[model samples]
Target: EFNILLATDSYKVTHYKQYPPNTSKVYSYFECREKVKYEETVFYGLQYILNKYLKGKVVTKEKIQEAKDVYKEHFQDDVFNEKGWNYILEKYDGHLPIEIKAVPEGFVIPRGNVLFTVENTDPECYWLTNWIETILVQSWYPITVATNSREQKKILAKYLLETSGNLDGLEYKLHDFGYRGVSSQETAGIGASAHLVNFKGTDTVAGLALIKKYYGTKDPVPGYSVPAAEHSTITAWGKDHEKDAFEHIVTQFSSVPVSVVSDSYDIYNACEKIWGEDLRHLIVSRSTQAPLIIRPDSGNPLDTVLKVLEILGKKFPVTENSKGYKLLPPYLRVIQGDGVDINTLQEIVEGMKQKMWSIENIAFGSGGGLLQKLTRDLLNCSFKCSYVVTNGLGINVFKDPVADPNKRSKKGRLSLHRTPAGNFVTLEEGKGDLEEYGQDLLHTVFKNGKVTKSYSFDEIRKNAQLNIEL
Candidate 1:
């Protein structure tokens, strides 16, 4: 058996502890805590050494733990023992190497493509490969969110340009209002990254911390505040609560496109009673330029919005400044929220066309449907491939399983490039494959367990923003 020095916090090197040779020994967490932690230090040390000597990248905490567990489980049996684990550790010593080839964060990629790849200098640590899953999945949230948001923005842009015929004059901002809708704080950050790509800003305050930490910008500038294009909500409504709630929201926000939940008490009636001609004139006159938006929170949102728009058409005639209005109530537009998914948004768009209703006359205030439901699984995004190791000439080398015409991952290093015409593509294995159409997608993020490349939060945010055009 080959002896390896295990470093300790106490400043001493410990011997490699021996265990019974077995192919299948499952070590419980309690049994291996000390040993695992001890071994982990060596793994990290190897990573550091590799970065110092060979110029490897820094391994994230998630990636390191993943590699450790994979190595431990794969080498549980002593039959292969030193030859199995030691060979891998020694060869990859100081270089905990992995190569990721993925579509850039803001580009809209289709399904069944290789997002990235992870490997180590030590082949025995295969089990740790799965550990990158969580980080990988977490890392992808922003990309997916940004892609979907961009599509939504495009749809909005199309509608606004067509309806208003003032594409250049339109002043619009997209806001990520999904923090409260997400399951956790980390998810909020990921979602915020996505929204920032398409929307002008975000409503995730916690995500601002991440933005500042990762991107370097703070709230208000990258966030939403009063007097801006604000979107708030009233989940439910009561008889006595309706009037005060509506008035309170308007009073507090002071008409910067105040959207009140009118579905609490006969959505149509409530809209007419509260925001009809009298209220609209009062708000416009009082706030000067403040716009009042009436929102229908529930109950067949599409139909409800139509009904509300019809009422406003009669009560509030469109002014010369109001672009989409054919008749009256030009400034008063109906905003729909609640259970509005992509499919639903499509339906709303189709419904407006079928009914000949002005598209700009209706806006959307999405909650769970927009923020929570958009995902890779929900959107049919996936990553899959087959790989193998071949034994030849006293060495084991990796190979891709098959090269299909449409579906296949390029094995080895890769790079990304954008054409002058604004199309994004990946080159397989870092070759100048402009003719082959293989653009390299992954870049060396860390070298020798250290961060050689430093990226500010603004840099990432700007990268994400620019990806929208690409």
Candidate 2:
């Protein structure tokens, strides 16, 4: 009753009665129609939706009654599909009679390609395919976030290789601070899990729970984080005792990496006077100088990061990496968590390189930009009916508005193919056979209310290898 009948656009309820007569099947495909940010899209999050919302005996008499009552006042007419729903509840034991074929999760495909397709297996429930389109189409969220994160990884790798001479610690370079900035816990979970595909640093605990609950059980832990400080943790000790707060946080987590928010009062004073002068010995003299990261939360991110790095360099003994870029001492580093997005991060990295500073001297944390600052139109994701089977004939359905040719959708039965040279292409009008279309990459993942194909976290990470040609 919670979401089996309610987790959809309100208009989807009226779709059952509107389809043409004797509609035996409704087939639709999901794809990104346009490329906006990244040329490729990372497929993810549908497994979570299936396992969480569309699995097992979902439809029930109680839910049907509840939906019926809601629709009675919702439309103010006898337009609810009470009989159609009850037919599913009674005949199929509430298991959805639908089939879903999707490109394996974590596989990166070029834009304007079919990511997944759905069709009604039971002729009586032809409308069920589109009824669930509202939720299934939301795979765009994870796909967009994942693509953004992967693109960031590519950017980081390019800068790292050019300035730092190696990609060491790349996984920990981009940390996830998106939990508090997302719309809900589940949004944080989905977006953070997507980011984890490219990097393993995250403060979002919901992402870990999501990976354990839906992805698999073997690797219960998918990501890692360390003790970090916030404004309250530093300011709580009063302005005069700010140094004492930093002392306590580092001493508590001395053997591991620790981050301290140092911009409570003045960022430059905290870096130069406190971290560099008063706390310099304390930071460098620890048994394991676990890289006490100083975070400046306010200011123009590039200017502030370079300024902090310059101050720390003057105070601490800086060394030169193999690439001749200045490297911070092992015990000290900076983290720029403010104003971080894909574009800004790249700009900061380029700035560091221009200043002859190794990209390894700092890390990044992103909040809204990592998760909430995206939409379905980021890639122009959509789900549209392409092929349908009527009483005894097959019909190819499509839309090509005269006003916008870009809104033109694919026609007939569609299939995705990957050539031996590793390029993705979509074949329309039923050209998916192996004899001519190479190898079709689409695999059946769900059918008859059960997940047929399950890809583990590690397996997905392997599929999403960073092979950018930068």
Candidate 3:
């Protein structure tokens, strides 16, 4: 039960048997071409495979036969070659025979830019290397999550600057509550870690272990959550004593900012009568040391967020930013934790600006919309064979779909080089004269059987600039 991305795909790659023995190698590359904030991902999932899955022979005589014996139960044909499987297994002592050269992880590039190039490091490992590509593409989520989360940060950061006048509270602006909302534990951890690459507040604590295990903690382990109330905690108090529920929440977690769900019974009643009027004095008592965060859990965010902002600001005092927007005094704020997406998230902030309210009066929390609502194609990521070696000579290969111009892929040996203008362009040898400029941006991350570069969150977040977007 060793881990591989998309475990089912470990043996799912179609065989490259159409080519002959002289077809000595397969060189492929990975790139994205849609609008994405982080051109590169957090650069994870690949190395874990090297350390565990591919190291010292992940494939064996029994493992191969076991995979084959059960493989036909799901597929219409036998797609694996047993002979070549054993050949690579014996030659590399269990390591997959491929060289993976990539821009360092956390290095933000542009969308449509190539991030990594792969080819068989050993001639004997040719067929096996391509087999690994199909499986490796499963790691796309780390990049996907990284990009999605980074884009969200951009949205919040922009509004925070506009309405709040500075990014003082930006790190805590968006929180990750998506762990349970994702597909699996792996998704939970990776999705969590991906969000943390841009901001530090998270409820997906499980991601911290993944950061330690994968990113090496070279950066201060980056994630945190706060004490908060759930539906059960409030519901257990019953609706009749709703004011009592509100009072206990404030007093129990006194001297600390806490998130209490307000819509358990009647959000309007709780916000207006209970939290706003009844506990007004006590909440203000703790307001100087710790504040209460009102979470309006279910409703149209545009309506609920604006309504809650009105009620909270009336109950609390407001401060003025030099920008002329009014911020809720430091003691209180509202977190629109439900029904928030990129567009609505911005809508809430923009709505506040229109309402003459500060963006600092509110924050956003996303679960399903943050982590689960996406496909790899959102970034238009594609991994394909671009070159092959025939008779020991490398030649260009491409799939120019005549029916669809969008399907055109690059051909031949390629390098991702930056131009004099400080940007990136793909350089393909056979596509043109291919005189490259600047330094070759793609560096060696893995080769033969060793890891060449490993990235850390501290360094990546420090080095990455969200200044530009694709």
Candidate 4:
């Protein structure tokens, strides 16, 4: 028989230390305190893992404690302190710790896949079985979004590269514009991490801090400009004020890429009236980094963009034969800002099926719909599942009903296995089970109630990359 020693500063650790000398009292403590701490330890362990590994790099200790408080508030003090915490720590020491059977963080897992599982070491701690549900699901959901979004960007890149016939341009076209669309700052970090796996840039400035911390770059922006290059907004509202909007923008910033929104009174008329021979020189010469872009904020962006591009191509051709106009620089490009989404973007590309739009020549500013459109039903990012005990068996179960095969929890201490093919798999009830097929998901991230894992920001970024690739 194998004996594993689990020790902690908590009451259970103290009680277990006295087990051999005071059997009766130890048994009583086991009966009462054992159950309570078991649950608490499991909850703590999960919280510890999330705080250390998954949460944003800049997450404060207060934020982590808040997460713990959320757990405590949901489960109530009686079960949480007495059963949940102790059971997890005790079982891990006595039996094999919970195994993370299989997980590919960035993989687009479907609704009913078994992402992870947990079980117990000793039969007495069987109650610990149900305590893992809340944390497990909570951890997996955001990761799924990040994974899916990253893949979406990758698909977009493939289409653009194939269409443009320029493989090198693929890297520059992908940008992380999903940050403002996420719910919270933490979610933004996670989402940005997901996007960075495939996309070239991010709109979230906060993501820059995270990327720098995790990816080991002092600056992740491809250029030396602070705040990097951005597509600025200018509106005419109900009148033809393009010249006034243009002057306001050019005077404020030195040599910046300006996009003048032209769909106020009449989009095409505004472009022809404002950007024709009159102010074309000022617009073209305003920025050296990139050309001043004309943005049509309304109408069918596909049709409007093509029409504007055609006018610009005819008026200010890039070829050398246009004489003084050639020196004036070719009409920069037209950007479509309003109603640009995945479907609309696809439509724009399809509409120009035979022709090619310079992917670099276009810029988008996705607002409310892109950022705030997902209903709770679509994202469903919330904390559910909690620790429960019945007839001395402690378990973690989902509060929300999981459908079909994914409904079942791995009913004991769990461990994660990396298959020979590099896919992740989980082992059920690994606490006492000795068979080793993969690596354990939960590690001694914290010891004696103190954090032990000293993961650097680069390590986190590398982990995100590796996880996404898998």
Candidate 5:
């Protein structure tokens, strides 16, 4: 009556109603509309599902009946998928009857295009793919997050180049502080690993475990972090002992980087008086040095970071870049982990440049702003049934919502391909032969209840084809 793992998709009871009697096949696709730097999403998470769910070679009749009883018990007040439940029971002997394929992870592409496709490769299991739509196409958020982080990387890459003249410490510029800011640990694991594909820095220690388990990231995992102090540690030291708290961090990790949150009591005072005044001598006197990352967790990030830049510049040594902007010495730097998102992150960079400060002076740590604050609507992303069949007749299914014609979906069997100009184009079933679409972007990731095209975390990260013709 109670099973946890199988119950993951049991909540998708509503989807069972969409399939009709004698439904023979379903072909659905996933895509996003207009977006930022990502023409495509970072495809992930599906492999784990395939390995965990479809790994079973077959489903027994008694097993299907038990699932039905569980479903009936699960939804006492609502309707159940009696027809859909029976569809699978009669169809499969021991294996799930579906084929799933997706654009390989980290391959960038255009929005409003398909990244994945699911259908019944076996004629009799036509409605099986439709049953799995809710879970199968959820690649939306992970891909969305990975793409977002990748674009943010590109944006930072531009500033790092323009101001610092190179990609030094580029990957670690945007650190993941998003573990506690998300809905669940699952979200943290998924979103953080996506962020890792583009950058190597993170405080979400759980994400490294996720990468190792799901994407096969090897020993000596990529994502890393430094010993950092939060608000509680600063406050626990008492307001008068703020300098002591700061010194503790400095000396504890004297040979390595340390991030101390300075905004616990008075952020500006902590930066100017304690950090700039009293601690300056200790930082300079130390023979073996490490970068002291001053964290300003409150106040207007742009203004606070600018103020820290000015204070640190006056107290600490400064170097000049090729563009003549003032760069902070390696021994001193700043981290703005406050309310920073895409717009605010850009504004801080702009604010720094306006002050003639090098972008190398600061880094950003984003929590909810990086992981939790997004939805499918952000990219106009959706998964829809483009083609279907009843009994044996083909139906090119699509919806044109009366109020918004733009919501209209693609029709017929679908194939996604890339153009010579580096654009992504979807060829509807009848529009052209699948072969004529050039190289097929969708590779078979799963088939006949088996994971066909396996990808390692390193492989997918490399596949992040950032260099495009356009």
Candidate 6:
């Protein structure tokens, strides 16, 4: 037990006694109630939570006592539900008596629809469902990151199809450089893995390990990267020896594409004199088709990429593609890691299209912008109790606050369904229990003790594909 008992809000600790007397059951659901950044969302990362924190034998006597001690001092009273937790420990033998049903991982649905539902399986442990709401509500993070990443993919794919005639290298266009910029290792892993649902190119190794651990991804290499150099590697040899640093990097990574940060001194000077002039032979000497990926680590993303593309175009063998867009020689391209977000990325891509440069001429890297910069309100994520059974009598429950109607939640037991017209709709008051509402997209993902259904990396990527025609 990783003390999953304590991985919740202190206020939730008192929830056991707060529910109505004889509360036989409590049913709740999670959803993005309204759209902010995007109308549709790529549902992901719930499985990671299940495998990492909510799985088998989570509750234990020791953990229950630990929680008891902590809450006793912290709240200055016996506010913790020690007895309730001990009952779970003794009866279920540390397995949570909860059932979680969710739409398949990577399933895309419009905002304002139910993504998952939670309920306590045992009548006596009805409060257990909402007790863990604080932890489970964290699905918002991965879902938001996944939604944002997919939206960026939409932008990238649009540009690729327009400028390059197809989404040839769309997966490699946006690279995850967000590991260090996130809140924690777990955040880096979870958020980056969510980004991978749309694309395979990432520098975050943590995301790859997460996919393997939680999603049972058999693909040994889930995310791809190159031997990329940072500012330190270039600056270590001193400013005078910049060309020497470039030469060493190209030689060491001769067989594959290598990214070198070219802005340590003068980016233009390095591009024109060092890479374009002095080391041109060495870079072109590699018979392998791998390109030398030049990274401009500072300045305006659109302007800098355009400037680098022009400099590289004048130096390399520039050719026109069938789409009438300019292409750099396969051995050279630029990646702008600084000042990049979805908006700036689009600006750079559209700027290149205006310059007749193919979208393949450049790639992007985002750190805080990709992972840490978003908010829970970006999708208006909410988790609320919609139904409950007390004294063996079931009733619909929801909140329609007079202060803010937008904050109002769903009513009744919910079921997510696919309409005959191939659209997602949430059937309220348990109407979806009937077969006529179209098959419920919500599948039982977790039962009393463990995850019942699992999805692989490939399946998630497939489910997340944009359903629109190019």
The residue pairs found clashing in candidate 5 are: 24-126, 32-112, 39-109, 39-110, 40-109, 57-94, 58-94, 58-95, 59-94
Instruction: Encode model 4's per-residue lDDT on 200-278: one tens digit a residue.
Output: 4556556555545433443445212112223334443224555666556655553655456666566676567667666
**What TM-score would you give candidate 5 relative to the actual structure?**
0.90
For candidate 6, the per-residue lDDT at 86 reads 82
**Runs with alpha carbons beyond 4 Å of true place in candidate 2:** 287-289, 468-470
RMSD to the native, candidate 1?
11.1
Prediction 4 global C-alpha lDDT: 0.43
What tens digits encode model 5's per-residue C-alpha lDDT throughout 1-470?
Answer: 32212444655556546577777788887777553344556666667667755655546556556666766677765465455445555655456667777877777767777778888776665656656665655667777788788777777877877887877788889999999899998889888888888888998887888778777876579698888898888788887899998988788878887888888888878878898898887676553247788888888888888887888888778889898899877778889998988779888888788788988888999988889988877766777888888878999999888998778888887777777776778888656464665766688988776788878888877876355211
Alpha carbon lDDT at 373, candidate 5: 89
Give Cα distance to truth, residue 261, candidate 2, Å.
Answer: 0.8
TM-scores of the candidates in the order shown: 0.65, 0.97, 0.92, 0.58, 0.90, 0.97
Error of 3 at 282 (Å): 1.6
lDDT (0 to 1) per candidate: 0.46, 0.89, 0.74, 0.43, 0.76, 0.88
Q: Considering TM-score, where higher is better, how would the candidates rank from best to worst? A: 2, 6, 3, 5, 1, 4
TM-score winner between 5 and 6, please give it.
6
Candidates 1 and 5 compared: the better one by lDDT is: 5
Q: Report lDDT (Cα) of residue 145, candidate 6.
A: 91
Better of 2 and 3 by lDDT: 2
Per-residue lDDT of candidate 2, residues 38-95 (tens digit): 8898898899999989989999988988888888898887677888889889998999
State, as a TM-score between 0 and 1, how close model 6 is to the true structure. Answer: 0.97
Superposition TM-score, candidate 1 onto the true structure: 0.65
Question: Where is model 2 poorest over a 10-residue stretch in terms of lDDT?
Answer: 431-440
Q: Which residue runs does candidate 3 get wrong by more than 4 Å?
A: 3-14, 34-45, 48-52, 72-79, 218-220, 287-289, 430-436, 468-470
Q: For residues 6-50, what per-residue lDDT tens digits would candidate 3 score against the true structure?
A: 244544345556666678888988877534245544454555545
* TM-score, cand. 2: 0.97
**What is the per-residue lDDT of model 1 for residues 160-201, given as tens digits with 9 covering 90 to 100?**
555555443122333455678988886676566546544554
Query: How far does residue 383 in candidate 4 sit from its true spot (Å)?
Result: 9.9
Best by lDDT: 2
